[PDB]
Design an enzyme around this catalytic site. Structure first.
Site, PDB file in Angstrom:
ATOM      1  N   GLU A  12       0.844  -1.180   0.000  1.00 10.06           N
ATOM      2  CA  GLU A  12       0.000   0.000   0.000  1.00 10.06           C
ATOM      3  C   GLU A  12       0.892   1.247   0.000  1.00 10.06           C
ATOM      4  OE1 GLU A  12      -0.528   2.720   1.964  1.00 10.06           O
ATOM      5  OE2 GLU A  12      -2.076   3.406   0.509  1.00 10.06           O
ATOM      6  N   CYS A  59      -5.994   4.974   5.858  1.00  7.03           N
ATOM      7  CA  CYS A  59      -5.701   3.811   5.024  1.00  7.03           C
ATOM      8  C   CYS A  59      -6.943   2.991   4.699  1.00  7.03           C
ATOM      9  CB  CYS A  59      -4.658   2.952   5.699  1.00  7.03           C
ATOM     10  SG  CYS A  59      -4.070   1.573   4.685  1.00  7.03           S
ATOM     11  N   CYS A  62      -5.817  -1.230   5.425  1.00  6.88           N
ATOM     12  CA  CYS A  62      -6.169  -1.470   6.812  1.00  6.88           C
ATOM     13  C   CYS A  62      -7.328  -0.569   7.211  1.00  6.88           C
ATOM     14  CB  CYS A  62      -4.988  -1.395   7.754  1.00  6.88           C
ATOM     15  SG  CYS A  62      -4.243   0.246   7.873  1.00  6.88           S
ATOM     16  N   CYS A 544       2.719  -0.443   4.560  1.00  5.83           N
ATOM     17  CA  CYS A 544       1.569   0.377   4.267  1.00  5.83           C
ATOM     18  C   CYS A 544       1.992   1.819   4.499  1.00  5.83           C
ATOM     19  CB  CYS A 544       0.407  -0.055   5.130  1.00  5.83           C
ATOM     20  SG  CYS A 544      -1.104   0.837   4.726  1.00  5.83           S
ATOM     21  N   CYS A 547      -0.490   4.525   5.847  1.00  5.14           N
ATOM     22  CA  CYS A 547      -0.386   4.335   7.287  1.00  5.14           C
ATOM     23  C   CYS A 547       0.883   4.944   7.877  1.00  5.14           C
ATOM     24  CB  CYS A 547      -0.387   2.864   7.623  1.00  5.14           C
ATOM     25  SG  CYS A 547      -2.095   2.262   7.850  1.00  5.14           S
TER      26      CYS A 547
HETATM   27  N1  FCO Z   1      -2.325  -2.723   9.480  1.00  6.29           N
HETATM   28  C1  FCO Z   1      -2.256  -1.604   9.192  1.00  6.29           C
HETATM   29 FE1  FCO Z   1      -2.143   0.131   8.701  1.00  6.29          FE
HETATM   30  C2  FCO Z   1      -0.253   0.082   8.850  1.00  6.29           C
HETATM   31  N2  FCO Z   1       0.901   0.101   8.952  1.00  6.29           N
HETATM   32  C3  FCO Z   1      -2.414   0.587  10.425  1.00  6.29           C
HETATM   33  O1  FCO Z   1      -2.662   0.713  11.520  1.00  6.29           O
HETATM   34 NI    NI Z   2      -2.689   0.632   6.204  1.00 10.18          NI
END
Ligand code: FCO
Ligand code: NI
Ligand code: SF4
Ligand code: SF4
Ligand code: SF4
Ligand code: SF4
Ligand code: FCO
Ligand code: F3S
Ligand code: F3S
Ligand code: MG
Ligand code: MG
Ligand code: MG
Ligand code: MG
Ligand code: MG
Ligand code: MG
Ligand code: MG
Ligand code: MG
Ligand code: NI
Lengths: 550, 267, 551, 268
Positions: A12, A59, A62, A544, A547
């Site tokens: 991500e 995000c 997630c 991510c 995030c």
């Molecule tokens: N899993 C996830 Fe997103 C990340 N790094 C968050 O909290």
């Molecule tokens: Ni995330």
């Protein structure tokens, strides 16, 4: 020589990795988050109750996690005890979401580091099926399934339009699977998409949709429990949820868990590299009492890889946990560089371009009492092993038993501090989450049956005073925390410290190296123009970057 | 041969891509194997780094005039574009280059459609919409945070099947999905009409499925198909049906601007 | 002789009693009896013609859709309405998808437990079972692991001591001939079939508004509003959703149902030599594709004395030869008027006087075609298509025969299709060909909408005086269906349904000639007269629907 | 573990109420019969026929006396001493009264058993009546619709199994979670109704914009049910009005099968 991997795909968000390579081995690395939004600033000066709907958009991979952490942060500040039915619902959502998340990570994001689709074209489908006898009881490993899958690959390749498969690392020297196992993996890749879809149907039925659920509140949840009500959460709707919960287990246990052992069996050297840290943190998760506690999963802190002397964390109000956390921006594109406790945190952009020795990331550098720490499934598995959690030891043992059947060798805990150990921790988590789902569905049905339909306690927010709260959550990628300061009834400070921040963050105030950067030292790179080996280790952390940076 | 698509993420949370993983008609696997050729998408692409950059350049050349360009996320213009840098260059440059040869251009999600959450409050990065970055081009807007993926997929299908975009409103949103206020096609309208309102989550009226106007429902000022198409194709699943007001995430100036519990203006 | 009664016959729709005289272990004479009547023809009388379809659809919920479609066709016939082509495409998709569900359920849920012994399945080796299907099927859910999962479900059920729908079945009966392995294969396919039929009905639901009992028809077309750019109507997103389910049907139909048909035939070859019900067969053309209620995708016709070479094609639902031939008698039925009646002149006056072997013994009427007994349904429709030289039908039959030949070393001739197994084969062939109907009509709809035609409905006018008559034909899952409406002073003055199970299940007629069910049973060996599985095997091959037969 | 027993008897049924189960997803019919219940008698699915299936019925009525749920679809014809539905040589009303004696709970699935339905409409040729009418001393749970969404039935059964009692019922003994509200008091086309935005003919411009179907004869204003919310077949968006056709009032006695499709409803 110096290489750049930009963009890193099959994560991500926006990540750049740089590596110095000396004598065919990575000697030094840099991790860089290359996109910032300023979500902490966007949410400032609002009513505490509004934060979750905004910061959930940190995000969408997630999804759910930041929403949940945000309401927990507000509830922390305000001293609100969440109704147990709201906990059950929150828990089911988090567990089902995480099931989707982990499956997609292993297959859609990670598998094409290890799997060569070209080689799958050379496979014998019957031999492939035969390889899994006594390894799996999955009902969709027939030669006929595998032939169907092989024919789809054949047709794609024949079309000359490879799309997402174009210019992959086919034939790379680090690709070690036999044709048959490549084909098995591609078949499982496609099958995984149905399983993750079922997991998200669980999420949707309680969240109101996914991505981005819409059923939370500071004070509990918006779901109206009424077995006798039309248009609300009644027994018919609960039965529907259950119908999807029950569809997840077989794939997770008979495919994902097995494939994890299979990849380990063919890539055993990846148990000997990719160590990112010697300290690990996880928070307990899935509270089941009326007072924001009694977690189904334990948390804790491991220092210098010593499980025997770990420190348990059993409360989201643990002052030891709270007081240890700081973030630095010495090597990040923010102005204030000294370590900051998040209630006192700032996020003042100060972009000055890339410098190897200066600032090179939008990710901050978190520490715990001044140390670098890995978070996420490796941390959470090691903590559960340290806690003597039988369910975790047993599930790890099942993976090891498959590995032993395939290789004649066993796995020791020392070998889990590695790229493959990290992948294994994620798989173990996904497996144990299926019991969380069954447990919490049953708890909800039982509690409703006792006559408790309460879901929400309306908050009050004093218009004077300064109140600080922190919401912890064990997210798919590790410990998440949202830190809210309320002053004169509105958010005066908001700081998210996100698991990928811990792992991806750049060199810190003492120029110590974070997990991603540390994990890469020693990585052999056969072909510097196509550094597959680097991406293999980085993917193991499930980056991510939306995030990490927010 | 399948119609080519180039997908570029700017200041995205990935929720708009993730919507595709919930889709059923087509499923994401049928989308990429049967419906389109997804020539560039960083979340799913086997290639990384220099190899995936080669894929992009090759596709822009090979399919000049033919591909659909899709962007999720807002595009940050503050400080010369440095708040989103891919392969060492501002994303706005990658997007403008790709837009040059596009047969059609789609802003998927509220961020790309009108700036969305990333452009809210003080707008730290000077985030703007795809249309604002491409003033000479017709951008099809498919808002929502994220939209039901079929709002996107059926728009692409219309282009493929009938050789032109679906009919659009004066915000360039497809009328099949965005032609009507949620409140002008909401199953709780009878309760609104009768003064049957939830006042707090968990109260007796809320637990009877009454109207959520007094909880802050933005259905009265939000165009979308959330009450009809709903989400995830399971039946009965959208925020209001689950018990929570619409927040107006589709609609510029509503979602991410108004408080959850702030009341909507009713026409 | 010995006399047996089978009452109720289970694993059909509705209420059926079968009686047999047995001589030295062979059925010598049979009686078929529909034991429930509602008077649906009387209930619908004296209403607006537009209202009929919603009421008479409730003749049957197994063959839901069919009576609704026949009813609107009958009204349109009376009124001289040409149905918009988009309405035809939609009606056609519904009927084809419905019939796919219906046939799958008939082969598996209704019929398989006549041929399949679940007790024997418990003794199977799942690996051997999977191995038996190599080079016979490419289905992806024939693994040993699938079969073990299924075997364990049976084991658990039997262990529970609560056999439920499986209690007191004909396990170990001498007419059960499958090896353990093939019994397990069939049970696995029985369970898999339930998902495929569910997908077929999702197609129906998205156009019908629900199923059972669709709600999208009208005298004049359909209620679906076609607007690719409209919210809340039949737009491209909704059509894509329909297509997603259409595409899910083919593999099960082709790789499981079609294959199992050949497998059952291979193990039960004597059932190609019994169960002949008639020497005359009728089907109507189906799936109209023009703007004038014609241009059918499937042909119809009339076969006399099993002579395909001299059959009579039927290409129109207005065919005067077809219309004028149809009559029904109640000589041996519980109605008052016994002479053969053309349906526009039909009555349905109940006259129950209990069971008599030589008198009245059924609520089913006795239909004839120019005075002859006729079998309708998938055997009829297959034979008519073969007589027409329809290549698609010959090819599909040839695929089943190829599998049978692989398993037995033998071929099948058309003579062998006039049988219990031939009838089952005809149904399978139908189900297979219907998947091409669905693709064809979905494509036609998308294309037509693309040309700018969104028309779906022609509003009828109904003269307030005058008496006029119409008939709606439909090739239903169980055979030729016709609804016959007389309108007088703007309301229904007569309504008569002549339903496919009426043709097949009807009792002895005005000339005491025996109809298909009764005829088919003559010669049936019965090993155990207390447990006459052989009788039920032949009866089930006709897919009885007694709500249909009687109404 | 032992599963709760169910005895299902069809009277003047079209089989649509059984067929509803084949569309169910929670549970699917295969999970219903293998995991949720023990379906001790059901003539549409039972392996046994004739004397064997009769034995199954008797054995179940004895073994599970006081414990089984009895389900009936179809109307019960009383004219001419019950002869319009005879099974194994006896009026179905006799089979039903016998089975009702030992029932833990009794459910009329569908409009026919709930209130007579189509089979009792108009001139009522067979003197068809409802299940409750034949069992005056018993509490019959009514699950109307022609046929109902199967989960209106399955969630009623589940409530009995899981919580040991029926769901809350209205004064027609219909479960409130499914029948507690008029369709028109929870219909997504109410805004159009309110604004005077009406389809006048199928295929007209308003119809093709998803406007209210009141002027086409929609019976939503006088029909209790969950068709607009639960809808049908679990695919999303599928119920008669959403597809473009008015509600006919099939749930509701005196509406469905009485009023013409295009006859206007009374609005309260
Ligand atoms: N899993 C996830 Fe997103 C990340 N790094 C968050 O909290
Ligand atoms: Ni995330
Ligand atoms: S529109 Fe919403 S889901 Fe899509 S990128 Fe923006 S924040 Fe994420
Ligand atoms: S205010 Fe919201 S819940 Fe109430 S009728 Fe309008 S859109 Fe529906
Ligand atoms: S209620 Fe309707 S579907 Fe059920 S038996 Fe009666 S006519 Fe058939
Ligand atoms: S009349 Fe019918 S379509 Fe119109 S609002 Fe009422 S229930 Fe809905
Ligand atoms: N198929 C079917 Fe029903 C019967 N017989 C009708 O028509
Ligand atoms: S918050 Fe968004 S998803 Fe729909 S219900 Fe409101 S526009
Ligand atoms: S006709 Fe029946 S199915 Fe519902 S929409 Fe009306 S009550
Ligand atoms: Mg599925
Ligand atoms: Mg309750
Ligand atoms: Mg932060
Ligand atoms: Mg399915
Ligand atoms: Mg034989
Ligand atoms: Mg037009
Ligand atoms: Mg008749
Ligand atoms: Mg009398
Ligand atoms: Ni029928």
């Amino acid at each position: 020589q110096r290489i750049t991997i930009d963009p890193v795909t099959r994560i991500e968000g926006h990540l750049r990795i740089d590596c110095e390579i000396e004598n065919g081995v990575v000697s030094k690395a840099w991790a860089s988050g290359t996109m910032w939004r300023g979500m902490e600033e966007i949410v400032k000066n609002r009513d505490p109750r509004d934060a979750w709907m905004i910061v959930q958009r940190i995000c969408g991979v997630c999804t759910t996690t930041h929403a949940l952490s945000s309401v927990r942060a507000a509830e922390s500040a305000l001293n609100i005890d969440v109704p147990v039915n709201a906990q059950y619902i929150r828990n089911i959502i988090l567990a089902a979401h995480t099931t989707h998340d982990h499956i997609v990570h292993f297959y859609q994001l990670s598998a094409l580091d290890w799997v060569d689709i070209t080689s799958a074209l050379q496979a014998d489908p019957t031999k492939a099926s035969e390889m899994l006898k006594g390894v799996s009881t999955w009902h969709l490993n027939s030669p006929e399934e595998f032939t169907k899958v092989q024919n789809k690959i054949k047709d794609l390749v024949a079309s000359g339009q490879l799309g997402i498969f174009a210019n992959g690392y086919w034939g790379h020297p680090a690709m070690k699977l036999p044709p048959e196992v490549n084909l098995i993996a591609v078949a499982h890749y496609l099958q995984a998409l149905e399983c993750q879809r079922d997991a998200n149907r669980v999420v949707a039925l309680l969240g109101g949709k996914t991505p981005h659920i819409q059923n939370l509140a500071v004070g509990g949840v918006a779901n109206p429990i009424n077995l006798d009500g039309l248009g609300v959460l009644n027994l018919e709707r609960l039965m529907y949820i259950k119908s999807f919960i029950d569809k997840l287990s077989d794939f997770v246990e008979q495919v994902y868990k097995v494939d994890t052992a299979v990849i380990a069996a063919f890539y055993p050297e990846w148990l000997t590299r990719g160590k990112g840290a010697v300290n690990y943190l996880s928070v307990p998760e899935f509270p089941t009492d009326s007072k924001n506690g009694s977690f189904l999963f334990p948390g804790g802190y491991i220092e210098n890889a010593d499980l025997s002397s770990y420190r348990p964390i059993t409360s989201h109000s643990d002052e030891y946990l709270i007081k240890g956390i700081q973030e630095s921006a010495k090597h990040s594109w923010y102005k204030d560089e000294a370590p900051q406790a998040p209630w006192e945190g700032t996020t003042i952009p100060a972009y000055d371009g890339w410098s190897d020795d200066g600032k090179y990331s939008w990710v901050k550098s978190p520490t715990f009492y001044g140390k670098t720490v890995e978070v996420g499934p490796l941390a959470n598995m090691l903590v559960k092993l340290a806690a003597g959690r039988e369910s975790t030891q047993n599930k790890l043992n099942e993976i090891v038993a498959i590995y032993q059947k395939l290789t004649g060798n066993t796995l020791e805990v020392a070998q889990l501090h590695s790229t493959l150990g990290r992948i294994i921790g994620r798989t173990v988590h996904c497996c144990e989450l299926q019991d969380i789902l069954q447990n919490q569905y049953s708890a909800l049905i039982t509690n409703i049956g006792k006559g408790d339909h309460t879901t929400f306690v309306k908050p009050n927010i004093p218009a004077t005073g300064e109140f600080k709260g922190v919401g912890f959550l064990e997210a798919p990628r590790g410990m998440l925390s949202h830190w809210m300061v309320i002053k004169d009834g509105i958010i005066s400070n908001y700081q998210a410290v996100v698991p990928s921040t811990w792992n991806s963050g750049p060199r810190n105030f003492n120029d110590d190296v974070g997990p991603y950067e540390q994990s890469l030292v020693g990585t052999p790179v056969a072909d510097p123009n196509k550094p597959l080996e680097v991406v293999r280790t980085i993917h193991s952390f499930d980056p991510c970057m939306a995030c990490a940076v927010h | 041969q399948r119609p080519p698509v180039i997908w570029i993420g700017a200041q995205e949370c990935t929720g708009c891509t993730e919507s595709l993983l919930r889709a059923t008609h087509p499923t994401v696997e049928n989308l990429v194997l049967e419906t389109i050729s997804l020539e560039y998408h960083e979340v799913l692409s086997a290639a990384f780094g220099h190899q995936v950059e080669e894929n992009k350049h090759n596709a822009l050349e090979k399919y000049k005039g033919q591909y659909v360009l899709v962007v999720d996320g807002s595009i940050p213009l503050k400080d010369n574009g440095i708040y989103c840098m891919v392969a060492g260059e501002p994303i706005v440059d990658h997007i403008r280059k790709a837009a040059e040869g596009a047969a059609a251009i789609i802003a998927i999600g509220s961020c790309s459609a009108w700036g969305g959450v990333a452009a809210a409050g003080v707008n730290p990065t000077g985030a703007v919409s795809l249309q604002e970055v491409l003033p000479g081009k017709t951008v099809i807007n498919i808002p929502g945070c994220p939209p039901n993926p079929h709002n996107f997929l059926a728009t692409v299908a219309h282009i493929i099947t009938y050789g032109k975009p679906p009919k659009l409103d004066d915000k360039n949103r497809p009328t099949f999905a965005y032609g009507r206020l949620i409140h002008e096609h909401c199953e709780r309208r009878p309760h609104f009409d009768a003064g049957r309102f939830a006042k707090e989550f968990g109260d007796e009226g809320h637990r009877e499925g009454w109207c959520l106007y007094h909880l802050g429902c933005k259905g009265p000022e939000t165009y979308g198909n959330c009450s009809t198409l709903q989400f995830c194709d399971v039946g009965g699943v959208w925020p209001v049906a689950i018990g929570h007001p619409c927040y107006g995430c589709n609609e510029e100036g509503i979602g991410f601007h108004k408080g959850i519990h702030q009341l909507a203006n009713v026409e």
